[PDB]
Scaffold this active site. Structure first.
Site, PDB file in Angstrom:
ATOM      1  N   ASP A  93       0.854  -1.180   0.000  1.00  0.00           N
ATOM      2  CA  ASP A  93       0.000   0.000   0.000  1.00  0.00           C
ATOM      3  C   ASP A  93       0.892   1.232   0.000  1.00  0.00           C
ATOM      4  OD1 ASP A  93      -2.182   1.665   0.031  1.00  0.00           O
ATOM      5  OD2 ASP A  93      -2.801   1.200   2.084  1.00  0.00           O
ATOM      6  N   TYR A 162      -4.937  -9.579  14.635  1.00  0.00           N
ATOM      7  CA  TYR A 162      -5.560  -9.619  13.305  1.00  0.00           C
ATOM      8  C   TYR A 162      -5.503 -11.036  12.728  1.00  0.00           C
ATOM      9  CZ  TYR A 162      -5.982  -4.543  13.162  1.00  0.00           C
ATOM     10  OH  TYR A 162      -6.359  -3.242  13.411  1.00  0.00           O
ATOM     11  N   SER A 188      -5.322   8.333   6.106  1.00  0.00           N
ATOM     12  CA  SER A 188      -4.511   7.400   5.327  1.00  0.00           C
ATOM     13  C   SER A 188      -3.596   8.120   4.327  1.00  0.00           C
ATOM     14  CB  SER A 188      -5.363   6.325   4.656  1.00  0.00           C
ATOM     15  OG  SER A 188      -6.138   6.843   3.593  1.00  0.00           O
TER      16      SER A 188
HETATM   17  N1  LIG Z   1      -6.023   2.575  12.163  1.00  0.00           N
HETATM   18  C1  LIG Z   1      -6.650   2.901  10.969  1.00  0.00           C
HETATM   19  C2  LIG Z   1      -5.903   3.374   9.866  1.00  0.00           C
HETATM   20  C3  LIG Z   1      -6.575   3.690   8.712  1.00  0.00           C
HETATM   21  C4  LIG Z   1      -7.995   3.511   8.686  1.00  0.00           C
HETATM   22  C5  LIG Z   1      -8.762   3.798   7.546  1.00  0.00           C
HETATM   23  C6  LIG Z   1      -8.055   4.342   6.338  1.00  0.00           C
HETATM   24  N2  LIG Z   1      -8.980   4.671   5.257  1.00  0.00           N
HETATM   25  C7  LIG Z   1      -9.236   5.954   4.915  1.00  0.00           C
HETATM   26  O1  LIG Z   1      -8.691   6.885   5.466  1.00  0.00           O
HETATM   27  C8  LIG Z   1     -10.164   6.208   3.768  1.00  0.00           C
HETATM   28  C9  LIG Z   1      -9.332   5.859   2.523  1.00  0.00           C
HETATM   29  C10 LIG Z   1     -10.080   5.924   1.203  1.00  0.00           C
HETATM   30  C11 LIG Z   1      -9.619   6.778   0.207  1.00  0.00           C
HETATM   31  C12 LIG Z   1     -10.286   6.844  -1.014  1.00  0.00           C
HETATM   32  C13 LIG Z   1     -11.400   6.035  -1.241  1.00  0.00           C
HETATM   33  C14 LIG Z   1     -11.861   5.161  -0.255  1.00  0.00           C
HETATM   34  C15 LIG Z   1     -11.190   5.104   0.967  1.00  0.00           C
HETATM   35  N3  LIG Z   1     -10.512   7.620   3.620  1.00  0.00           N
HETATM   36  C16 LIG Z   1     -11.747   8.114   3.864  1.00  0.00           C
HETATM   37  O2  LIG Z   1     -12.651   7.379   4.227  1.00  0.00           O
HETATM   38  C17 LIG Z   1     -12.019   9.554   3.605  1.00  0.00           C
HETATM   39  C18 LIG Z   1     -11.059  10.338   2.935  1.00  0.00           C
HETATM   40  C19 LIG Z   1     -11.283  11.663   2.647  1.00  0.00           C
HETATM   41  C20 LIG Z   1     -12.492  12.265   3.019  1.00  0.00           C
HETATM   42  N4  LIG Z   1     -12.766  13.593   2.717  1.00  0.00           N
HETATM   43  C21 LIG Z   1     -13.968  14.155   3.015  1.00  0.00           C
HETATM   44  O3  LIG Z   1     -14.175  15.329   2.708  1.00  0.00           O
HETATM   45  C22 LIG Z   1     -14.977  13.420   3.695  1.00  0.00           C
HETATM   46  C23 LIG Z   1     -14.761  12.108   4.047  1.00  0.00           C
HETATM   47  O4  LIG Z   1     -15.688  11.373   4.718  1.00  0.00           O
HETATM   48  C24 LIG Z   1     -13.480  11.480   3.679  1.00  0.00           C
HETATM   49  C25 LIG Z   1     -13.242  10.126   3.966  1.00  0.00           C
HETATM   50  C26 LIG Z   1     -10.127   3.624   7.563  1.00  0.00           C
HETATM   51  C27 LIG Z   1     -10.787   3.136   8.700  1.00  0.00           C
HETATM   52  C28 LIG Z   1     -10.075   2.830   9.831  1.00  0.00           C
HETATM   53  C29 LIG Z   1      -8.671   3.019   9.840  1.00  0.00           C
HETATM   54  N5  LIG Z   1      -7.957   2.735  10.925  1.00  0.00           N
END
Ligand SMILES: Nc1ccc2c(CNC(=O)[C@H](Cc3ccccc3)NC(=O)c3ccc4[nH]c(=O)cc(O)c4c3)cccc2n1
Length: 238
Positions: A93, A162, A188
């Site tokens: 990733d 996990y 992320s």
């Molecule tokens: N410990 C962790 C580390 C990462 C985690 C992630 C990472 N996914 C994420 O961070 C995902 C990645 C993603 C990118 C593009 C398309 C789909 C998904 N990003 C998002 O879900 C994300 C990114 C930008 C955004 N901007 C906005 O204006 C509004 C949003 O609601 C928004 C949400 C998600 C959940 C738990 C985690 N726990």
């Protein structure tokens, strides 16, 4: 970032906010300045992104409110995704953004050092995850860049947490057993930055986890040291 606090302006000068302009402009992911024309980020950030033309990289930002239609940004010339990448949870990733123009370094914006293969044995005890992400699994993007100090955990420990996944040596995990501090949605692609002997190194890239900050669910990061050869190869001229 869950359980974090506001950053000081200029304290994470390698941290960028990557925006998409489609359909309207918003924060997409974090990323890290690693060279004058290069941002290191997560491959999963580009799901559904067909062209680099909809991307904008902003550096030297503390508050999202600083970004307006008249704010200067870096265009993205090329998105380079690891050719082994399939999805965040199975590793690889990692992605490079080649910028259209070069970053002029200053104390608002400058690169973070990549880890040395010789640092694989170093015990980091001063690691921080940063970003504009959610403060809880159901939340929204934050105005001010947040930071949280979190301990690394061993891959053996991470694997126990996990059991439906394979935690490889190309991943690295960080979190408290009791939870409470973690990356979350919107964080992320950003750095996990560890300070050792007065020098910051880009140890991880925020990748995935089960929920945010849960008990016995460490955050999972791309283990950057495992990709220094790849980064060199891909950032070499052609
Ligand atoms: N410990 C962790 C580390 C990462 C985690 C992630 C990472 N996914 C994420 O961070 C995902 C990645 C993603 C990118 C593009 C398309 C789909 C998904 N990003 C998002 O879900 C994300 C990114 C930008 C955004 N901007 C906005 O204006 C509004 C949003 O609601 C928004 C949400 C998600 C959940 C738990 C985690 N726990």
């Amino acid at each position: 970032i869950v359980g974090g606090t506001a950053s000081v302006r200029g304290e994470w000068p390698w941290q960028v906010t990557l925006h998409t302009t489609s359909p309207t402009q918003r924060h997409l992911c974090g990323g890290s300045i690693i060279g004058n024309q290069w941002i290191l980020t997560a491959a999963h950030c580009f799901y559904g992104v067909e062209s680099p033309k909809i991307l904008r990289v902003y550096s030297g930002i503390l508050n999202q409110a600083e970004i307006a239609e008249d704010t200067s940004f870096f265009g993205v010339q090329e998105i380079i995704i690891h050719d082994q990448y399939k999805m965040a949870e199975s590793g690889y990733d990692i992605a490079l953004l080649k910028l259209e123009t070069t970053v002029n370094y200053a104390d608002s914006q400058r690169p973070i050092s990549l880890p040395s293969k010789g640092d694989r044995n170093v015990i980091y005890t001063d690691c921080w995850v940063t970003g504009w992400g959610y403060r809880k699994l159901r939340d929204k993007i934050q105005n001010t860049l947040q930071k949280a100090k979190i301990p690394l955990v061993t891959n053996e420990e991470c694997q126990k947490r996990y059991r439906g996944h394979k935690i490889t040596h190309k991943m690295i995990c960080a979190g408290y057993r009791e939870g409470g501090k973690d990356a979350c949605k919107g964080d992320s692609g950003g750095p996990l930055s560890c300070k050792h002997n007065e020098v910051w190194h880009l140890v991880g890239i925020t990748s995935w986890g089960e929920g945010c900050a849960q008990r016995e669910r460490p955050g999972v990061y791309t283990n950057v040291v495992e990709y220094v050869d790849w980064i060199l190869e891909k950032t070499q001229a052609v």
